[PDB]
Write an enzyme that holds these catalytic residues in place. Structure first.
Site, PDB file in Angstrom:
ATOM      1  N   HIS C  44     -49.105-137.073  21.137  1.00 38.97           N
ATOM      2  CA  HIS C  44     -48.955-138.535  21.177  1.00 38.97           C
ATOM      3  C   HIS C  44     -48.265-139.092  19.940  1.00 38.97           C
ATOM      4  CE1 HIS C  44     -52.732-139.078  18.728  1.00 38.97           C
ATOM      5  NE2 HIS C  44     -52.099-140.182  18.361  1.00 38.97           N
ATOM      6  N   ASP C  91     -53.119-132.951  24.274  1.00 36.64           N
ATOM      7  CA  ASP C  91     -52.515-133.736  23.209  1.00 36.64           C
ATOM      8  C   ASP C  91     -52.247-132.826  22.010  1.00 36.64           C
ATOM      9  OD1 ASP C  91     -51.492-135.762  21.665  1.00 36.64           O
ATOM     10  OD2 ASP C  91     -53.449-136.670  21.217  1.00 36.64           O
ATOM     11  N   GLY C 192     -53.665-143.602  11.940  1.00 36.81           N
ATOM     12  CA  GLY C 192     -52.857-142.950  10.930  1.00 36.81           C
ATOM     13  C   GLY C 192     -53.331-141.537  10.638  1.00 36.81           C
ATOM     14  N   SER C 194     -54.286-139.509  13.207  1.00 38.96           N
ATOM     15  CA  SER C 194     -53.852-138.805  14.426  1.00 38.96           C
ATOM     16  C   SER C 194     -52.941-137.636  14.112  1.00 38.96           C
ATOM     17  CB  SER C 194     -53.068-139.756  15.348  1.00 38.96           C
ATOM     18  OG  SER C 194     -53.908-140.659  16.007  1.00 38.96           O
ATOM     19  N   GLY C 195     -53.128-136.532  14.821  1.00 35.58           N
ATOM     20  CA  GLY C 195     -52.301-135.362  14.598  1.00 35.58           C
ATOM     21  C   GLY C 195     -52.768-134.473  13.463  1.00 35.58           C
TER      22      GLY C 195
END
Ligand SMILES: *[C@@H]1O[C@H](CO)[C@@H](O[C@@H]2O[C@H](CO)[C@@H](O)[C@H](O)[C@H]2NC(C)=O)[C@H](O[C@@H]2O[C@@H](C)[C@@H](O)[C@@H](O)[C@@H]2O)[C@H]1NC(C)=O
Ligand SMILES: *[C@@H]1O[C@H](CO)[C@@H](O[C@@H]2O[C@H](CO)[C@@H](O)[C@H](O)[C@H]2NC(C)=O)[C@H](O[C@@H]2O[C@@H](C)[C@@H](O)[C@@H](O)[C@@H]2O)[C@H]1NC(C)=O
Lengths: 242, 243, 242, 243
Positions: C44, C91, C192, C194-195
């Protein structure tokens, strides 16, 4: 700072950043070290209303704002009593630090000008700070200290420029004797530079001619930046600073 | 308007809304019809810099903003020459409409006060407008015109209030002779009310005592709203607006 | 990161920051170095729509964002084909750098877990990143990398939590098998983050258990952060990463 | 509504506005009157989390939003149990009003379609609402109800469009059977239109083909607006709504 460039590390050792308590110690104005224990800045940055000193901190010169912070508390805030709003002048204030700071080549005071220096048009001068790089355009991280050379406009000429395109009567003075004008449509200070210095080189020596005070927009045509004229307030400054 | 209520349809027939060309004709200031062809407002609403008239329209008394607009163009703007910023006074301006509006019980002028009226404390007065209902709280749709009764504070008392908690020396006058103070921490005007009227019922008659000028916040303790004192500029007004 | 502390310089040498070309190379997502030439992140953060690689850069472990940047171009982005939206899983994405980075004690890869590791409740795990410190509260300058220990919640327990107070039927699975839950109302990741990595200390070794994926708010009661479960995608990863 | 025009007063008598309590009763989604006591809308407007009914109100057709409000409380909110997020479908909900409303020429129900109507490309259909007129561009006051004719795109064609320029595998279905696609790069619904109706004229009769559900931008190339296909949920609707 509009239209400038990042400052070399060896330049402007007297530049300081004023911080207010808000989730983090946020920069809101500039200032200059004029004595090891005193910072010169704009009255509008710390007044007219009296503020709780616990909410303010001073940061000495740093190439990049926020990265190597060593915050310094203030012991006393002295605001010129004639100050109420920027357009009426006396926009100047003094901050006495809790302790004198160490003086080195990278961090030291700027000299105030002799009472006789009028800083006429032609004088090479620079304004420095971490403010916006244009209207509604904040300085991007990592927040380098910026500088820009700004041309001085004689007071009467500047007063006339301010009346250009305005309803205000000519006999109504906009630019006062305790003010100084600098900058043009490409070079100027902007939001966040307030309270910082305007320094000019006179016979190889840097002298602080002004304190960033107000304007009608960043680098706007016929609306040069307005600064408090330091020479006008030497007697007041000398009443507090050794 | 902070702390007030929606005004009844038959009240304040002289109230006007000033609009600026945006994605729509957006309200930005109030004003009052003081003559069939003249609107009284604050200079700061239209200056000190000269603006292109093409971007301005006047809207006469309406119960809800934008609903049934019948916008009027402005023939000319006259700003008092002593005006530069609100804090130094002379915050007053006149807008001449292209033609005289049709006077009715619904829409008509407000009387200006005689030069001797000082509007002392205790005098019943109302400020009206479509401004914010509180600091950073815009008037909600359908934007009814609001009103609020505001207490008058004598000039010197008010000037002393503005120095409370400030570095400003006492010898420095903050509230000037061409100003008037009204409002408290509960009732006051707010952003968007500027230029509108402060009207007082004096011996059965409604007289416009002030024009919303400035302040240091909406309904903020010890900082009443500041208004341009109309009696101070009667001669200036009568230089342009027929008696 | 909500409820954590600034990470010590020597911790999380695999952490990376993903930057998008704006008025500066702005941080928008985290990632982890899982091989000298490969960064693991959430799909995402880079999809489902294909974006121009020219607008992306990778920044390896740094203590403060933006201060000492040495941006790296991305040669290729591989997004799991089953990915469309975070709530339906898959994801996860891989970023191939143009060159293999120089491995050191300060910057190196994180180990992936063996397929059998389930990371059950009670397992000590940390999530790291430069994301918001609370809902609508961005990390303040100088943007230090933060860390926070987050409690693991078993999948079904977590899925039941997500149905509490919702119209969603119990036969509708919210937390999928390729997901993992961690966090509580005091500690969690936030916008922020995320990932970035969720790493757990398993018998003396740091293993990356998850990739920050989604949730229903930061440190919100009864709604633990949701992470992509790394073991679920080991074969997919190993199809591209040596 | 992007690319449309203000609706004639006589059109879309079934359009409703859903309001949430926040300083004022603020519009946040559309809906349609499908029975004198029932409103059809999107599950995402009132879920998946159960909301306090005291914070919701329904407003029947108004030419201008907020101007002649007559708010109606809701007695019950029924959300499809398969709903969790818009991209997975079942984005449909029912609101039972505390009381049946009066039916007139200006305000009345829309007919639901027969199970067999597929609404193929070429059918004339309109979506209506008070949403944004473009990305990040809100409808300006006085907030007229807008309408726009949107072309129908067959599901398979629409699913292929959604994979254009995306990493998602072709074998991964984005547009499901309980969805319907309509709109193009100049005509589409936008923020605030959600939950409202997509109606098509079939042999002189208006039928509600869809409920505004989701999409990728307002009138974005290769990303038509996505609607919940009403025919797919007729059995569920009929479980609560009479006749
Ligand atoms: C200002 O300069 C002073 C003189 O160099 C610093 O004090 C000196 O600190 C040295 C280590 O930083 C130490 O070797 C010196 O003996 C000491 N000298 C004296 C006369 O104090 C000062 O550093 C601060 O003071 C020292 C004593 C420690 O408390 C440090 O933590 C402080 O940073 C410099 N910084 C100031 C005064 O802001
Ligand atoms: C539904 O339709 C009824 C018929 O038009 C409304 O009642 C009528 O309301 C008039 C004022 O709005 C009133 O002069 C009529 O005498 C009255 N006629 C009847 C048959 O009652 C009704 O309005 C509501 O009910 C009436 C009794 C009043 O209480 C009104 O204030 C109500 O709005 C309509 N219902 C609604 C909810 O609009």
């Amino acid at each position: 700072i509009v239209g400038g460039q990042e400052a070399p590390r060896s330049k402007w050792p007297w530049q300081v950043s004023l911080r207010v308590r808000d989730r983090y110690w946020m920069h809101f104005c500039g200032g200059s070290l004029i004595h090891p224990q005193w910072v010169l800045t704009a009255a509008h940055c710390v007044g007219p209303d009296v503020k709780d000193l616990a909410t303010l901190r001073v940061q000495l010169r740093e190439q990049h704002l926020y990265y190597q912070d060593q915050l310094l508390p203030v012991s006393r805030i002295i605001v010129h009593p004639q100050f109420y709003i920027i357009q009426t002048g006396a926009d100047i204030a003094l901050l006495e630090l809790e302790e004198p700071v160490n003086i080195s080549s990278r961090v030291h005071t700027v000299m105030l000008p002799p009472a006789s220096e009028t800083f006429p048009p032609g004088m090479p001068c620079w304004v420095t700070g971490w403010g916006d790089v244009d209207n509604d355009e904040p300085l991007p991280p990592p927040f380098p200290l910026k500088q820009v050379k700004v041309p001085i406009m004689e007071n009467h000429i500047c007063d006339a420029k301010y009346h250009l395109g305005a309803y205000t009567g000519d006999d109504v003075r906009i630019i006062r004797d305790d003010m100084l004008c600098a900058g043009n449509s490409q070079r100027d200070s902007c939001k966040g530079d307030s309270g910082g210095p305007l320094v000019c080189k006179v016979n190889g020596t840097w002298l602080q001619a002004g304190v960033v005070s107000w304007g009608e927009g960043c680098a706007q045509p016929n609306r040069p930046g307005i600064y408090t004229r330091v020479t006008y307030y030497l007697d007041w400054i000398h009443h507090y600073v050794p």
